[PDB]
RNA sequence: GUGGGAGAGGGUGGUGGAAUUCCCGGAGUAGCGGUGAAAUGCGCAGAUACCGGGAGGAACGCCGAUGGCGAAGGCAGCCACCUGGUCCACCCGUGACGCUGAGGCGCGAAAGCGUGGGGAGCAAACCGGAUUAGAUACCCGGGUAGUCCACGCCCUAAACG
RNA sequence: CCGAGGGUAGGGCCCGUGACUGGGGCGAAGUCGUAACAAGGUAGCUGUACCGGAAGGUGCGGCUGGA
RNA sequence: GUGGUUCGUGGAGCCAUGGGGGAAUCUGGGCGGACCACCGCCUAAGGCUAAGUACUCCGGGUGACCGAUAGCGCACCAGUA
RNA sequence: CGAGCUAGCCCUGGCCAGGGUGAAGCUGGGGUGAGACCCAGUGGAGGCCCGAACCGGUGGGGGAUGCAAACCCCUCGGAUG
RNA sequence: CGAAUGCCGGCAUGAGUAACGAUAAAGAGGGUGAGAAUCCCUCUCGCCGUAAGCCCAAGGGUUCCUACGCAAUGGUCGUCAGCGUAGGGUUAGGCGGGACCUAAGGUGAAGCCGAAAGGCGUAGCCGAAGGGCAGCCGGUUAAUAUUCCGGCCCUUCCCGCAGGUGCGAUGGGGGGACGCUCUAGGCUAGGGGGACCGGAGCCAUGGACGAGCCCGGCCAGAAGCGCAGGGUGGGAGGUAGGCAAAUCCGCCUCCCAACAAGCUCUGCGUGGUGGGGAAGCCCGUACGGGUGACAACCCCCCGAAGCCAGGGAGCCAAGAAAAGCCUCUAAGCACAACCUGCGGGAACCCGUACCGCAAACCGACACAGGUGGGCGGGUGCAAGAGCACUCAGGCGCGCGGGAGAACCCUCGCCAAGGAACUCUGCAAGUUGGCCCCGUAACUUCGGGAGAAGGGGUGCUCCCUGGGGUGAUGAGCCCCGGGGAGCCGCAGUGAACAGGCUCUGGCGACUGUUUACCAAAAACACAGCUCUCUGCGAACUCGUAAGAGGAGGUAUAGGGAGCGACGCUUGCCCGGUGCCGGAAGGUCAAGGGGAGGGGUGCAAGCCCCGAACCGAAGCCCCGGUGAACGGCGGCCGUAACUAUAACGGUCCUAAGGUAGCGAAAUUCCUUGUCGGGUAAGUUCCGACCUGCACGAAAAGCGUAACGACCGGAGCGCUGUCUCGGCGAGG
RNA sequence: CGCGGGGUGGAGCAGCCUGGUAGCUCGUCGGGCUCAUAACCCGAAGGUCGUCGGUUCAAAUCCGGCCCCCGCAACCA
């Protein structure tokens, strides 16, 4: 049947997006974090134009 | 009047709609002095603090004169009566001389053509409105204000009315459609006659969906649920309570009163 | 037809006072209620009795009669509108148009029912107190539907001259 | 083609019968109470309504076949 | 009414405080474990102040530390696949 | 950290083949003092009826290291709310 | 280190075993090649065709196209490839998105709130398949094109000229602007027919040179018309409203109109011109090209759900905003500015390849699953998007070959019986579409109803009645009637297409639910009742601010239970709850201090501390059951026995009424009578000794309703006696 | 089998738990009123307290054993 993922490019940065995630105290945080382990990417890698 | 329906499918028999004979020719609403943009929306900001509401149809909003001393002395000509989704009155629109349209809660009487004024001058006939001093004691009056300026609040609900009673000083004793004897301040409008359109408490809703349209959900007993979401809730079948009837939050719901205690407005009440 | 007469005949709207019950203020105590006798009941948490105010409901004392009116049921404070019947005189008009009435139709006390309002007094059911052998009764204290209005039904009667 | 009749299907009227049940009629001397007739010891009768082992009681209005 | 101290209401001070009341300027004020007397110690309600102490992203030295299932997760383009 | 599955509601768009049944309401007639009411003809109501799309998931069978961590076949509910 | 279902890695066993991913299907010749069932070609066969064919959108991200290549990836093979190496390929003022607008909602100056982090928050901003908005048709590439090119046609800005006019705003008004269902007129898309027109060709096998078969008979298109249809009154005075001002809008009042007459604005034709253009035949593809061709390019018919669109009618549940656009005026400014024509110039950023019901997206996979929007041709079946076949197009589902045991899966059929099967007719069968006869109890007069039960259904000829388009006619296309006659076992001849009734239980009913074992008698439901709440309402969220409630106001809102409807819903307030009781008893801090202690020579300082004054709560006094709940025991009695209308007594707060009862409640129990049966622990009707019904956790009924549960009959049957043969996987 | 409640004049109930004392309503007997019966009035009688044991000076009363009676439990499988 219909499954958990249903891609969706706005939905995608607009919740784990850069701009998303520094809003919020928490989420600045998550950044700080994924810096400083090192990550290539600190948020999801959403696209297109 | 109340349009009944032959049995052609069960509900639609007993079921009933409203007569709308008292609409004149009007229907397609006033833009300007309304409507406006009406958010409907069953909670507050997030959460759901009103429960089973939502869902039934659009609606738009009717933006009604409910404080006449706005056009003292101007009086304006009663030119149609229509359907306001919003309440149970039926309104009616009026252009005053001055240019100006406005809604206005319809009192039962009032016929299209119909002159109709406010302030202290006044004639006493449907549809004027006064300060309550300036009011016969005795008459029935609706659209009534509780403090001066504030706006009507009193009175608005269909075909509903309060008769004066008596003065008392910068006061006049009221009788409320809930029978509460209220004093109220002199200075407080109250366009007179009843609401109208009283018909309104026989209209036999009909089937499960005439309640959907109004925009209410399904209205679930405690004594369904289980004791997790509300007290009256489990164990084997169904069961008698156990306890004293309470809310989903817990309070007694069989006779505990509940006005908060010492209220300012105590002293200006009399009765039940 | 013309001109008049009496009437609680009928419908709607409006209004008056007396009394009752309740609420509020004054004043005032030790009992009030009730019956053949009492008890239940009410009352020092302020009753009964008196005064002052307020709310509401229903029924209209004297006039009143053994009277009037209506086809019956039935109709009674006062005002107004709308409305039916009816009697008298004048003998003017039509000119036999009349009597009865299966059926249909309309009306129809009280109780009752539907939907909504109202609810003072009363009062089925019911609960208490007496009485009795026992009382699901007669008496006493409570008291709900109902009695009141609107509309829709219900068609009964010792609807009896 | 029609057609006596037979077959299938479902209605209409009637008679018979059925555990059990409703009230009824009749049956010399069983039990309960006393309702009515004298003013019947609550005048009675009444349409209706509710209640009660039972006659019956009470409410509303009516009638004299009572005062 | 509470917190801080070893102090859990204890005979419960002191030092902080939200509530209420509410002074004085050296013959003034706090403290020395309720309180009171004496004998002493300090001078609240303004502030700044090195060094000695903490740590190790980083540089260096050494190891009765490891030697590719050990050692950091990774000795190797790993916070990767 | 999650409502890209799922539950609810908010804003704004889309979708529902083809047949049945026939409500009120009109119109003509009947009737009455005037009605009620009775007839047709019209009319197209409806959590109405059959039935695709579509939304389901009743009964059986298969499938059970599957085609599939919910599937397949027959059968079936609703389908202008 | 030998064990911890230990941890990591490597290798065994099951085993050449199960599988090889839909049962839509393959065969052959010829290529290429080291190597072909599997790659290319051709011939034949089969499959989908409201898709298994095309166009978008979302997602994916090089998968597109071409060249060279098989180690791996392909469930086998592989010369193939969605795979490996390299190169090429996506062109826009008109499409979509942005230099336009606003919805929900976010953001958020002012303001308010919060230990901090932060929470709200009218203005503004942001926010989109909603509004506004200028491109159609054809040609070219191996791969892009409404983008390149051809033809035809537009939109803005800026700079000019030529004329007109008080011009002019984020401000005023108007407009934009709106539901659901049903719909009229005229068009288009699309499709059917043609004795007419245009064509390569073709007489097969017994007949046919025939108005013979086959193929095709358009597309776009400015101005101007023409045909439909949508919008809309024109004057003039008065004016105090439209938060300043307006000449505009609004409100009075006189005129003329009421018509679309006239102004506009769309659509559809027609239109200068521009373009396409079948079969077949020839060729070489991995495909496209050439000829047919000077191609013809015409006449009818059906006809929308699309267009005219802001069309109309009906209804109740009463149906966005903002901008663009018209208009109005204010500051300013009127040598500006704006409007109308004609020129010349300027017109940016991003997307565009390819997949797209799927081997490229969501499911670890070339996964029988999941995925919104548009087109979806023809004939026949009453209709249709259904069904069978089949166009265009696209497939044969990436392991094959044989064999023809049992046993499984899917399927077909059967003697005689027919439910005996079995927990249960589970399953399978029967029945089945349309047309016409004909339909009961009951009922809430609608329904029950498709009740049940029946007959008709093909084709041939004759006669005949309506329409519809054309003119009042031919044709072309729909609906009818009547009479003869033909052939089969059988005429919805295949495919799609109710088994039927009787009576019980539960629930009124349509709806809802345990995604992934329960779809129900459970939830919901109109409706009934109780209760709270007078409005800064009660209530709910929140520390607050706030927000919902509600831009509501007792015919209104919150909470509870009951659950269409009918007739009804008895008695107990002793206990608990809720409610009403300015008397009392008790009562915490606090007030008060009689009185007592500690220290001081002392004034003093510091403790204790009895009277009494002190809330709500409890006690107490009342009420209240559609509030929590409760609603008896033992004896005796009648002129056959039997039983008890009657009585006695004990205890209670009162001592279950009506109605129902071997029950969805009944243990003893297959109670006992009666009915269905040959036989009935189930079923139905009764009886009452109701272990242990009962009145809004309602009681007892109830037409209609049901993938709900029980009983029974008819029909029909492989369920069974009791099996048997056949088919494919 | 198990839990706890109960046997009192003729009937139905008290009487104990704090041992010495059996009380109430009805009924039965005698007498009255009435013509007579009932009612009502006046008086009177009746109880090995389920039984066998002992506990104490003394048992209805306290304690164990059986005889019936009534109510409650008999669950997980
Ligand atoms: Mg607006
Ligand atoms: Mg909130
Ligand atoms: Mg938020
Ligand atoms: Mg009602
Ligand atoms: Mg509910
Ligand atoms: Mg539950
Ligand atoms: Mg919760
Ligand atoms: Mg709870
Ligand atoms: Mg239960
Ligand atoms: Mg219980
Ligand atoms: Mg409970
Ligand atoms: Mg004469
Ligand atoms: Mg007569
Ligand atoms: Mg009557
Ligand atoms: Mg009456
Ligand atoms: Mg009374
Ligand atoms: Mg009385
Ligand atoms: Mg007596
Ligand atoms: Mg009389
Ligand atoms: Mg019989
Ligand atoms: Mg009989
Ligand atoms: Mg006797
Ligand atoms: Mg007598
Ligand atoms: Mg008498
Ligand atoms: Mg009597
Ligand atoms: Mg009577
Ligand atoms: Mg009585
Ligand atoms: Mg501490
Ligand atoms: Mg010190
Ligand atoms: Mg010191
Ligand atoms: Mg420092
Ligand atoms: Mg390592
Ligand atoms: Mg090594
Ligand atoms: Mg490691
Ligand atoms: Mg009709
Ligand atoms: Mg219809
Ligand atoms: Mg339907
Ligand atoms: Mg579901
Ligand atoms: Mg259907
Ligand atoms: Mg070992
Ligand atoms: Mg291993
Ligand atoms: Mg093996
Ligand atoms: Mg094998
Ligand atoms: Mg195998
Ligand atoms: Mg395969
Ligand atoms: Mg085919
Ligand atoms: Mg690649
Ligand atoms: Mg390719
Ligand atoms: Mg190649
Ligand atoms: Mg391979
Ligand atoms: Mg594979
Ligand atoms: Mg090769
Ligand atoms: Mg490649
Ligand atoms: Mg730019
Ligand atoms: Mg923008
Ligand atoms: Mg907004
Ligand atoms: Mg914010
Ligand atoms: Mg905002
Ligand atoms: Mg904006
Ligand atoms: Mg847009
Ligand atoms: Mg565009
Ligand atoms: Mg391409
Ligand atoms: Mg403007
Ligand atoms: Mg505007
Ligand atoms: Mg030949
Ligand atoms: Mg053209
Ligand atoms: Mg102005
Ligand atoms: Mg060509
Ligand atoms: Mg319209
Ligand atoms: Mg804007
Ligand atoms: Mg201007
Ligand atoms: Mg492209
Ligand atoms: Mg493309
Ligand atoms: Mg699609
Ligand atoms: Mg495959
Ligand atoms: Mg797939
Ligand atoms: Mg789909
Ligand atoms: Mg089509
Ligand atoms: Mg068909
Ligand atoms: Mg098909
Ligand atoms: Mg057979
Ligand atoms: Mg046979
Ligand atoms: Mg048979
Ligand atoms: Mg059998
Ligand atoms: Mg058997
Ligand atoms: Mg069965
Ligand atoms: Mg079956
Ligand atoms: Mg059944
Ligand atoms: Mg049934
Ligand atoms: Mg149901
Ligand atoms: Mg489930
Ligand atoms: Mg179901
Ligand atoms: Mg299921
Ligand atoms: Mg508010
Ligand atoms: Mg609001
Ligand atoms: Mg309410
Ligand atoms: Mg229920
Ligand atoms: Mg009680
Ligand atoms: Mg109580
Ligand atoms: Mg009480
Ligand atoms: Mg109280
Ligand atoms: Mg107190
Ligand atoms: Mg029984
Ligand atoms: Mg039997
Ligand atoms: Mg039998
Ligand atoms: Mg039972
Ligand atoms: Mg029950
Ligand atoms: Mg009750
Ligand atoms: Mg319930
Ligand atoms: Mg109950
Ligand atoms: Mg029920
Ligand atoms: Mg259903
Ligand atoms: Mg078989
Ligand atoms: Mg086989
Ligand atoms: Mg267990």
Request: glycine share 8%; aromatic share 8%; charged share 30%.
């Given at each position: 049947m219909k499954r958990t993922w249903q891609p969706n490019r706005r939905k995608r940065a607009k919740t784990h997006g850069f701009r998303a995630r520094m809003r919020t105290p928490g989420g600045r945080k998550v950044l700080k974090r994924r810096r400083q382990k090192g990550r290539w990417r600190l948020t999801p890698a959403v696209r297109k134009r | 009047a109340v349009k009944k329906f032959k049995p052609y499918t069960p509900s639609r028999r007993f079921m009933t709609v409203a007569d709308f004979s008292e609409i004149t020719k009007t229907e397609p609403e006033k833009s300007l002095v309304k409507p406006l943009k009406k958010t409907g929306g069953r909670n507050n900001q997030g959460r759901i603090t009103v429960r089973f509401r939502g869902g039934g149809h659009k609606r738009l909003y009717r933006i009604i004169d409910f404080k006449r001393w706005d056009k003292?002395?101007?009086?304006?000509?009663?030119?149609?009566?229509?359907?306001?989704?919003?309440?149970?009155?039926?309104?009616?629109?009026?252009?005053?001389?001055?240019?100006?349209?406005?809604?206005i809660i319809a009192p039962d009487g009032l016929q299209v053509g119909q002159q109709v004024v406010a302030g202290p001058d006044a004639p006493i006939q449907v549809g004027n409105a006064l300060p309550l001093r300036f009011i016969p004691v005795g008459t029935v009056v609706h659209a009534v204000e509780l403090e001066p300026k504030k706006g009507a609040k009193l009175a608005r609900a269909a075909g509903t009315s309060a008769q004066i009673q008596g003065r008392e000083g910068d006061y006049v004793i009221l009788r409320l459609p809930s029978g509460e004897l209220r004093k109220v301040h002199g200075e407080c409008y109250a366009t007179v006659g009843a609401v109208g359109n009283a018909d309104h408490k026989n209209i036999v809703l009909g089937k499960a969906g005439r309640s959907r349209w109004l925009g209410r959900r399904p209205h679930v007993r405690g004594a369904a649920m289980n004791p997790v979401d509300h007290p009256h809730g489990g164990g084997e079948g169904r069961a008698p309570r156990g306890r004293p009837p309470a809310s989903p939050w817990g309070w007694?719901?069989?006779?505990?009163?509940t006005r908060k205690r010492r209220k300012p407005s105590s002293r200006f009440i009399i009765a039940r």
């Open positions: - | 003292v002395g101007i009086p304006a000509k009663v030119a149609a009566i229509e359907y306001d989704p919003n309440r149970s009155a039926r309104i009616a629109l009026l252009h005053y001389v001055d240019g100006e349209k406005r809604y007694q719901t069989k006779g505990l009163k």
